[PDB]
Design a binder for this molecule. Sequence first.
Ligand SMILES: Nc1ncnc2c1ncn2[C@@H]1O[C@H](COP(=O)(O)OP(=O)(O)CP(=O)(O)O)[C@@H](O)[C@H]1O
Length: 1085
Amino acid sequence: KSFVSSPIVRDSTLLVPKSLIAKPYVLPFFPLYATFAQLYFEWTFVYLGTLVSLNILVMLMPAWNVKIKAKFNYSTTKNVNEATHILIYTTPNNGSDGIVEIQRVTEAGSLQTFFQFQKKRFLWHENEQVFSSPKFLVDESPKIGDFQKCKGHSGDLTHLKRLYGENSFDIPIPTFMELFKEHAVAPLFVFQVFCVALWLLDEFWYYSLFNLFMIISMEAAAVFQRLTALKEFRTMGIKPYTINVFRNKKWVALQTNELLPMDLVSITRTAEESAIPCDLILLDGSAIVNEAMLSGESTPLLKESIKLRPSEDNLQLDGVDKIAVLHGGTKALQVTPPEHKSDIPPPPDGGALAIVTKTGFETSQGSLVRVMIYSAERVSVDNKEALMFILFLLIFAVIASWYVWVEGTKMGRIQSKLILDCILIITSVVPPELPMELTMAVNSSLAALAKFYVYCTEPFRIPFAGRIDVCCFDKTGTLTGEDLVFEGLAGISADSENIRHLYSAAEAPESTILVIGAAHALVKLEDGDIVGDPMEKATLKAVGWAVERKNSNYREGTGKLDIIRRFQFSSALKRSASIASHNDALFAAVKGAPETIRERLSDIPKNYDEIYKSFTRSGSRVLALASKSLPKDLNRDDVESELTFNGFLIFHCPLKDDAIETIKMLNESSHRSIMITGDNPLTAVHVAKEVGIVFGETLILDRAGKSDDNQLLFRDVEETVSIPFDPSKDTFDHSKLFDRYDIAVTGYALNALEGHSQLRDLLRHTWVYARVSPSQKEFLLNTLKDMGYQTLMCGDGTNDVGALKQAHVGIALLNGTEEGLKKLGEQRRLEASCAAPFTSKLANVSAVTNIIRQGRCALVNTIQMYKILALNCLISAYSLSIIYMAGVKFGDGQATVSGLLLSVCFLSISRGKPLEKLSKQRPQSGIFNVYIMGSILSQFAVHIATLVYITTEIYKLEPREPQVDLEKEFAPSLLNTGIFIIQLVQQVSTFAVNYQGEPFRENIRSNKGMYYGLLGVTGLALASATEFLPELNEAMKFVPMTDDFKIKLTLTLLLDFFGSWGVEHFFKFFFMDDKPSDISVQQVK
Ligand SMILES: Nc1ncnc2c1ncn2[C@@H]1O[C@H](COP(=O)(O)OP(=O)(O)CP(=O)(O)O)[C@@H](O)[C@H]1O
């Protein structure tokens, strides 16, 4: 049981094919044909018809559902040598079931049973008798001695080639013919071609031909779209380029394809439009990688070797040992050759050494591409509401067809020809485009978005963006510009007679001007450039340093300084340290957040507590600087053991000019917006108040005293009010605290309140969170999802990738310039993050408003299309019923003209423009709600009332009498004319009545296309009805009408339109928008 062993599969059964005689249709259907031929040797024709229909349907049934295919064609067996096909039952969240072939190849005297499912290999291990995916050494149990031990592959590596495969993406794009063949067997297209075959049987020639051409066109267009999408995915593949590889104890040139795990390679500067081959791990040398893809930020990291680490005891952790790993798909700006000699010869090229770990689809970028392409979830996969809706429509059609049959039998008509009319009605009621509705809307919305440089990776998240309950933001990098102006240094003097004193430049002693030079991460590249964080470059320029090609940055007019070794910065550790050396001696510099640096240095200044609070109150951003003298490879807790103060850094943060308006629009558009930052709560509260998240006074939570006693104290921003709280005993007083202040919560108080009962009551009212570590952001977003509110997070950098992934819809704002993109587009004419579900290249923050508007428009357009299709189908069915009751029937030209005059409106209707300003009314999801059913049923009631009235009128003018053996021949008659024109006018009126309202997208008068189409079609229908022009009526074979009849015919249609408009307007006014949540209410203080 459960032969295949992998987290993808759930259960499997082996299969073996069967011959044609064993097939479930060919052999059992012979006796039926035999008895049919015996009985034959009129009414007997329908028997052969239904038998051929059942046969041709059974022949196609297997391709629809794979379980049916396995049950029909294949027989289950337990012999693993006999089996030639295997079925795979997938787990709930991974793809869908399928049938895959089992292949056999003999190598080294041993046969190997292997197949490939979802581009993830398998193999047959004899001792365990199970199918198991290949697993790499890094994942299971790394031994840091083995990595340094490895010396490269040698000998015949054929088994490895079989087990791990070629190291490249394998995405085949099929030909147009194969894809159209795959589409042809779909149930919907088969249903449509059967419907057209009926009309061909009913002697409708031109109508059927036009319908068939339209069907073919639609299918071809869909196939072109899908092929374009598959072609677009392939761009993530990288063209193989040559690197050197250590095989057979010497260096040989190989391509990127021939790479396997644990195989030595030498990487150089990444060529243009290329990246690192696969997931490496450094063994010697250095590099400067740019995690632009995975992380989403351009700041370059620094990677070092693994050689210095102890080999025996340590285990490769991928935690503190992350500086070695080099992910696949990130450009490496520079590499430095190995310093010292080792047993293995130097690389012929200047690159540093590396060891391979994973290849192909199992790397990070590769696994993400696989999940994006194959295991993605389609929009509305369940598709239950549409089936219930279609069952509703079929019930109505059966109600009509029963009366059709009764009247047809009563009027003497032959049943052999009446059953075809009944089937025509029943198959005519059904709208085919209904299940494939929302997909086209989402694709149109994506195409509209991509014009604003907002690229989408996973499309099925768009309907979530329509109705978002709460949306959260990051502070620096998202709401605040990237350029940072330097104000000055403060608090460096010890006397501190003035709290707000600034030493601009060259007024501080040598200590601090050396400190800022030592504690930096900038580096000058080979060709000559400077790459680093903008804040750091700004401060280093303003102070007056200059960085050279080597590590030594000098020529500041004060000496020559060089950096020996540096420690990496982290989010969880708010501190960065570097060790430097001067012409005289050696020291150590540290630079980090003030609250944490206060707990490290030895001499606590007298005004240290007060200066940074007094400066943080108004906008500024502050960092601390401390240095310690150190006499001549060591740990980390020794350099940051105890330090000495040197001064503060005070930066100013300029708001993005776009940030002010979007937040106001979101506050007025029935959304609640909160902030999640990293800085101390003073700057957070200040920016939140300047943008418009919090209006009045705000309260802050934090530790009460220096002792870690876990007691939280509500304290005002200006220290005027102090209110104590305890996590064990006291509980929040709603009226005293939450109504008056709208408190802001620090990360520490969130850590202490873990497990509390009123935690979820607290997380309702707070709008601002400060000093949170990346794990706490994930916790916050998961809790907000848990309460039932859908979320949106717009994040700047790698600080919050975990939070971005958890949100229902996430955006990553990559920094960019409009002029740079224009120049790049011009260069491309003259001649890709994958970090979050969505990506935006422009630095502006309007992308949130843009994507919300587009999602809302997609939803509301889906609703409109549902209603319009349903009503048109019902009207057509009942009109055909009323005609087919008697003997009369349409002509070919009349039906074809109706088809064209409706397709003209179909073409124009989809074109529309969204309103710029968002509206409070949020559209509800789901087919079944009071609005849709009420509107549809009432409009249909008015339509059938008018139709019954005019039918009674026409029967009263001319009476019909039962003639034996009626035959539905076309001839001009009052009934034909009246019903044809009423059908046309009402099918046109449904569009004009149910076009989507103003508050969401636009009015009807704004767009000229649909307006001119509707006015022209109504003018044509009227001029046909009011006999204004004789050539039109005489040329289309309409009977001349009585002067008394035309007045009633026109007035009933006019009143019908007005009644439909009135009812639809009432229902829209009353039951359209669902109520906003409780969290998003703009309560006053
Ligand atoms: N290279 C660096 N060196 C020293 N201190 C740094 C630093 N980078 C950040 N800090 C300090 O650590 C604190 C927390 O860092 P963190 O990255 O979590 O927040 P942040 O403001 O830098 C990004 P965001 O605003 O998106 O949350 C920062 O406020 C800053 O005081």
